[PDB]
Design a protein around this nucleic acid. Structure first.
Ligand SMILES: [Mg+2]
Ligand SMILES: [Mg+2]
Ligand SMILES: [Mg+2]
Ligand SMILES: [Mg+2]
Ligand SMILES: [Mg+2]
Ligand SMILES: [Mg+2]
Length: 169
RNA sequence: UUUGACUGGGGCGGUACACCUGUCAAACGGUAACGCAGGUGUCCUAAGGCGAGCUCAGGGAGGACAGAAACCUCCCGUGG
């Protein structure tokens, strides 16, 4: 019926903790993200200097990491369990991606540690079909055709099919 | 003994006094007014040299606190 190469999959899961300042909190936030995924994350600096937010330019204010494959699949399940497998209809972008936030990281089955603290984090899911890497390869770089593109509706349906989730208006 | 020069008289003023960009300038080049709009006496151990990878400004959509503005992601983006 459907081509096997049109199957939607998790291209990557992007986890971001924007602490907003450099020092104890960012270092501890990195440990939260590191032990949630097993991957050492990277520090994002501030592009501007905003007086309201108390951030200067070239100051590490956030910690983020990218996970792929089965490890990204199972972390995503923990996130939807916390969200009770339901998302608002507006959580889906027009490019076939969606995301959600977690207020407390220990809701993801992570033991709390007093010397670390409690943290929130941001989950962004990038979907895709086989062949999306042509836009990323160095040689013969190509742009995906219009039909391959994942529309907002086909991302919402995939969420309903896989995690039997709920879409709220 | 000296107490510059240019200058729509000289003085005051300015530097058109050594230079650079665009124009004037009349499609080679050259071309003047104390013509017009500006800049220079610096700065850099990299902002020099090579190589490698990468793509920018901006905009759209989306994502806990996060909002016009913090960070993450996708998309458009001939250089804006
Ligand atoms: Mg740090
Ligand atoms: Mg004279
Ligand atoms: Mg001379
Ligand atoms: Mg000429
Ligand atoms: Mg001529
Ligand atoms: Mg000429």
């Amino acid at each position: 019926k459907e081509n096997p190469m049109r199957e939607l999959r998790i291209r990557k899961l992007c986890l971001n903790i924007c602490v907003g300042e450099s020092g104890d909190r960012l270092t501890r936030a990195a440990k939260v993200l590191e032990q949630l995924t097993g991957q050492t994350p990277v520090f994002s600096k501030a592009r501007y200097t905003v007086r309201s937010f108390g951030i200067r330019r070239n100051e590490k204010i956030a910690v983020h990491c990218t996970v792929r494959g089965a490890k990204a699949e199972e972390i995503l399940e923990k996130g939807l369990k916390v969200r009770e497998y339901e998302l608002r209809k507006n959580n889906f972008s027009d490019t076939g991606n969606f995301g959600f936030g977690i207020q407390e990281h220990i809701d993801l089955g992570i033991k709390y540690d007093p010397s670390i603290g409690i943290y929130g984090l941001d989950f962004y899911v990038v979907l895709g079909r086989p062949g999306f890497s042509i836009a990323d390869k160095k040689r013969r770089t190509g742009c995906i055709g219009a039909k391959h593109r994942i529309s907002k509706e086909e991302a919402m349906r995939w969420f309903q099919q896989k995690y039997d989730g709920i879409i709220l208006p």
